[PDB]
From Swiss-Prot:
Interacts with POU1F1. At neuronal promoters, interacts with LDB1, in motor neurons LDB1 is displaced by ISL1 and a ternary complex is formed in which ISL1 contacts both LHX3 and LDB1; allosteric structural changes in the DNA binding domain of LHX3, induced by the ISL1-LHX3 interaction, may explain differences in sequence specificity of the different complexes. Interacts with LDB2. May interact with CITED2/MRG1. Mostly expressed in the pituitary anterior and intermediate lobes. It is also expressed in the pineal gland and transiently in the primordia of motor neurons including the spinal cord, pons and medulla oblongata. This is LIM/homeobox protein Lhx3. Transcription factor. Recognizes and binds to the consensus sequence motif 5'-AATTAATTA-3' in the regulatory elements of target genes, such as glycoprotein hormones alpha chain CGA and visual system homeobox CHX10, positively modulating transcription; transcription can be co-activated by LDB2. Synergistically enhances transcription from the prolactin promoter in cooperation with POU1F1/Pit-1. Required for the establishment of the specialized cells of the pituitary gland and the nervous system. Involved in the development of interneurons and motor neurons in cooperation with LDB1 and ISL1. It comes from Mus musculus. Residues 63-113, 122-176 form the LIM zinc-binding domain. It is found in: Nucleus. The modification Phosphoserine is found at residue 103. The LIM domain specifically interacts with the POU1F1/Pit-1 POU domain and is required for synergistic interactions with POU1F1, but not for basal transcriptional activation events.
Length: 182
């Protein structure tokens, strides 16, 4: 009975290959709003009719992330509500989100960081691993193609290469294992 101990070996690199799905989360809806005839939007009080009358408008829906209400043409409806163009930026990245949108933890986030921060990534440099790239994952967790190496040899381990997984997440060959602790 020759059964090797808790040992492993690098194999064919592969990834989850998903990149999330726009259909999953409710993306921003670019549509023409129907607020082109409410309150005093147009500058000055004129144009057809002459002198009109429109003061405060209570019980009116306010722009998502704003103090007043919407009254423009093109509006982005997302997160079960209408979110302005400039009022739809990532609270963290603060980058222009004029294409997609995301919500989580009572805050509007983007999909970019959702994959890295709220997804899978390298367990070495905390970098965001692509969606379907090509890399080898350590048993359960995933690692980098470059970061991958030995604690002593400091050399990457390609398919076929035998490496051990330390309790503190560390790659160690056979000879390095015993020499390391065992
Ligand atoms: Zn706004
Ligand atoms: Zn973001
Ligand atoms: Zn890394
Ligand atoms: Zn080694």
């Amino acid at each position: 009975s020759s059964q090797v101990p808790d040992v492993m070996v690098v194999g064919e690199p592969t990834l989850m290959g998903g990149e999330f799905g726009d259909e999953d989360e409710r993306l921003i809806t670019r549509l023409e709003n129907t607020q082109f005839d409410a309150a005093n939007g147009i500058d000055d009080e004129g144009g057809s009719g002459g002198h009109m009358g429109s003061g405060g408008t209570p019980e009116i829906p306010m722009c998502a992330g704003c103090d007043q209400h919407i009254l423009d043409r093109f509006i982005l409806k997302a997160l079960d509500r209408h979110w302005h163009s400039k009022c739809l930026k990532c609270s963290d990245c603060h980058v222009p989100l004029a294409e997609r949108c995301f919500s989580r933890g009572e805050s509007v986030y983007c999909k970019d960081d959702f994959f890295k921060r709220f997804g899978t990534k390298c367990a070495a440099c905390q970098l965001g691993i692509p969606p379907t790239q090509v890399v080898r994952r350590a048993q359960d967790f995933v690692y980098h193609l470059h970061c991958f190496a030995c604690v002593v040899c400091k050399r990457q381990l390609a398919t076929g290469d035998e490496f051990y997984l330390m309790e503190d997440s560390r790659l160690v060959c056979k000879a390095d294992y015993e020499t390391a602790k065992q």
